[PDB]
Amino acid sequence: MDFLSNFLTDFVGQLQSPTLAFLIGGMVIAALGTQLVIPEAISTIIVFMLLTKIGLTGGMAIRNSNLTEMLLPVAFSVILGILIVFIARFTLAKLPNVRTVDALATGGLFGAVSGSTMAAALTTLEESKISYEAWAGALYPFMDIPALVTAIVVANIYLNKRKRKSWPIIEESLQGPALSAMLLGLALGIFTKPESVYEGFYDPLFRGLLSILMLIMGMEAWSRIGELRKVAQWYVVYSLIAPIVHGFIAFGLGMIAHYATGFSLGGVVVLAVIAASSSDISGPPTLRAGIPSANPSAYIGSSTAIGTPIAIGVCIPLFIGLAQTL
Amino acid sequence: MDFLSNFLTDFVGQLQSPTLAFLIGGMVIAALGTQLVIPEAISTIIVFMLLTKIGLTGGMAIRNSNLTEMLLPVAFSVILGILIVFIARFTLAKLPNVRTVDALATGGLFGAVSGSTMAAALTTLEESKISYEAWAGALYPFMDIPALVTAIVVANIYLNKRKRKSWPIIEESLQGPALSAMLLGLALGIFTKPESVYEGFYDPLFRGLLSILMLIMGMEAWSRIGELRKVAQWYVVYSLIAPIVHGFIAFGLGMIAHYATGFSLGGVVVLAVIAASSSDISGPPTLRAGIPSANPSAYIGSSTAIGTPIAIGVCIPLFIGLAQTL
Amino acid sequence: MDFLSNFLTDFVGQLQSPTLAFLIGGMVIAALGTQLVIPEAISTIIVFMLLTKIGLTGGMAIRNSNLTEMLLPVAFSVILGILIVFIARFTLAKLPNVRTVDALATGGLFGAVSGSTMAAALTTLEESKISYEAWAGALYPFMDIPALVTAIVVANIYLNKRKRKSWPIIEESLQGPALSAMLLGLALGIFTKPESVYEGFYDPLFRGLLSILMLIMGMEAWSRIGELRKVAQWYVVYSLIAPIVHGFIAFGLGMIAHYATGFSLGGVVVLAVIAASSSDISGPPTLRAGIPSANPSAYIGSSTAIGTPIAIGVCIPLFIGLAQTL
């Protein structure tokens, strides 16, 4: 039981961690020139082979675990996935002039991430004291598959009832790169035994390859946050606040499992930081071929530029301190 | 001494191994769409740097071993390499209408592989009980270099004595990518001491990079097995049977070294699965620039689609059970 | 205390080491054809992510070390960096017809390397007996940053006072690829704590990725040493001698820190082989956009073809024997 004095010394040392240090280490070079560029072939084998580590981890956790205890955490994740896009359909919409709903339901892409909460939460979760379950990454496909289709279906059915009337929807999204690269991980995690290729090639160079992909995402965010000044003054305010308010409606909704079906308080924090995350890798390859009328800076510049630096900044050392309070 | 009841429980658990699980895990996504694609630059640094692990392994095994015991296994491998293409020149040729000999001697490309028998046999050989020698991968350059030139020389001299007359042959094949990438491994394995770069970069990420290359080979095999319906009904029958019959003429011919030398009975099985393999990586970069009039689906669709799934399916758990019978 | 008899048995076994063995293993295949080629996307993610290991190593060595003992080795490195280009402005210039000074001050690019002296000296330094300090790679940014700008500024101010008059200079060089990839390593080595991504992804596959990059550099050196016959007969003589004479003016100038500072005698040798090195990776991306009138074979063919094979050939086993004499 320790105050906000313990918070500030965590935030300095968690900004100093090697995942976010390259992100703000890529912004600071892009403000200085830097003709450095990683080619497009490397940045599409880092998008694969880093969404296969998450599929294999979630797939291996379903074999060696009972399917009794993993009902309440996944029914509080599907419901927690669908709820986020409807809140943003009521929160961010009823606003001044930037209320282009198809560029606003996609701004509620806030599903789950790879860059944090699988390598940021889990490496500071068991760094200090507290332990968690085996199915950390098994809550990644849930709240990512349902949280993106409801962005598509809502923003597609809203367009037909206004401009035209003045399975094939989910099929083009799920059949695509960086989302069939994850379902290949689950089917080979549930059915087969890849314990010699996961631990040895996909698992040791996972934390390292994330730092290359948070260098691309850092220095392609310097111009895109400057181009965001053209769009609005309200996507900034939604970006600083909604990664906070999506945690507390998940932290209390995750506080039902504790007083019902296990789900250790050390696991609730690995459910509440997942829901405040703003997808980066599974996100923009979808929601662009699914929703073409997109304005592709409102939902990317609010997730990779302001979204995840606050999602690793002021809410993972927050909910560790909330977990240490109990 | 245990019956076919022990065979079926091996085949289920050997189809569940992480090498063939991605192959039939790449077919099953390609039947479902999957805009996923690994770019051409990555799939030509996986072809190199996986034929350098085999060159370094065969090259290191020749230094720390006597050149007395490695004469009968390599004279029963060169002879076993040249014999396969002549059998197919007599077996598959005297047939109905698909007997285009230049698309048939290349269908006898059945040399040695990387994808199995170096990572499929050797990881199930010493998985259970039985031990083998040090020169497992030193039988890879033999029965691969002579088994491809005799595909070229026979199908080139047959064309000149029929259409035109109605060293420079082997030089264009051996001087090419994915075959000079292997001789670079041998010359740096015999002469130099790369024990700090092999074990540390080429050896730990060998089993992992094979699973990316058996994902390309899996989802480029869905259309190519459907295009094979245009060609014939006889390249299928040669594909299901010749990886069985090339083993027993190698298992008994390897049974002359166990009763005269000592490459041991656990080594004979790592000679008989090598000869029933249907090359995948050294194969099609050769036999295309060497033999242009090729019809490049008859010899690739019979080796990477039907050839190697039977070569890991029903003949590596077979000859382990034959070895456990003795 | 042991004679030149111990030298020859080192040179045979140090030519047999896996760094230079691929270099002369890439020349010997390029004299034989070899359609093998590593694509341009791979050879620009090996140039990055191998100049980030050197930035992180130098950056981590400045945190956990006092800034008292690292003044005399870096003031004997900046001065040793600027002196080399002025010697070559007086040695190589006053010559017959090939004295094109802008193709001659760049021929004095002899700063520091990655391919040797970080993986060639340091892996034979602590191989036998002798120990060195912690800041081996922290002498890489020094004598590389000042040694290239003085190649640019001298050869730019010489052109203006002869053809035209018959910060923005260093800015275009330092703001570029393969040199901002190193300053990203230092700023993330001094300020942050990347001890979980360095040791695990950048450090284990450093020695291996150097052998791919000394395979490109080996087989792109066969034609370029033949094209060097067109240029001169004097860039050869400067290439065989100046990696020897730059060591002894550094070995005695490093012998002032052994009798006035803590810089040990085992560290002097890791200062004197650094100054006889002829840059390969940070070199030619600079000095080409900085100095366009370059004749880009005089300064590359003298550094990657004759420069570094003598810089690993006859001067790292030399100065180990000089260090073992004392």
Numbering used by the authors:
A (entry chain C), B (entry chain B), C (entry chain A): 1 to 166, 212 to 371
Quote the paper.
SbtA, which is ubiquitous in cyanobacteria, is an inducible high-affinity sodium-dependent HCO3– symporter within the TC.2.A.83 family of Na+/solute symporters. The sbtB gene from the sbtA–sbtB operon encodes a PII-like signaling protein that senses the intracellular level of the secondary messenger cAMP that correlates with high Ci conditions, versus AMP at low Ci conditions, thus functioning as a Ci sensor in cyanobacteria. The tightly packed trimeric structure of SbtA is exclusively stabilized by the gate domains at the center, with a threefold axis perpendicular to the membrane plane. In summary, this study provides structural insights into the cyanobacterial high-affinity HCO3– transporter SbtA, which exhibits a new architecture of Na+/solute symporters and its fine interaction pattern with a PII-like protein SbtB.
Here we purified Synechocystis sp. PCC 6803 SbtA and solved its cryo-EM structure at 3.50 Å resolution. Notably, the TM4 and TM9 helices in the core domain are unfolded and form a crossover at the middle. In the gate domain, TM1 and TM6 are divided into two helical moieties, forming a kink at the middle. Structural analysis showed that SbtA of a 5 + 5 fold is topologically similar to Neisseria meningitides ASBT8. The trefoil-like helical bundle of the gate domains possesses a completely buried interface area of ~3000 Å2, mainly via hydrophobic interactions. Structural analysis revealed that the substrate-binding sites of free SbtA are inaccessible to the solvent from either intracellular or extracellular side. Thus, the structure of free SbtA represents an occluded conformation. Substrate binding most likely promotes SbtA to adopt an occluded conformation, as seen in our free SbtA structure with a Na+ bound in the pocket.
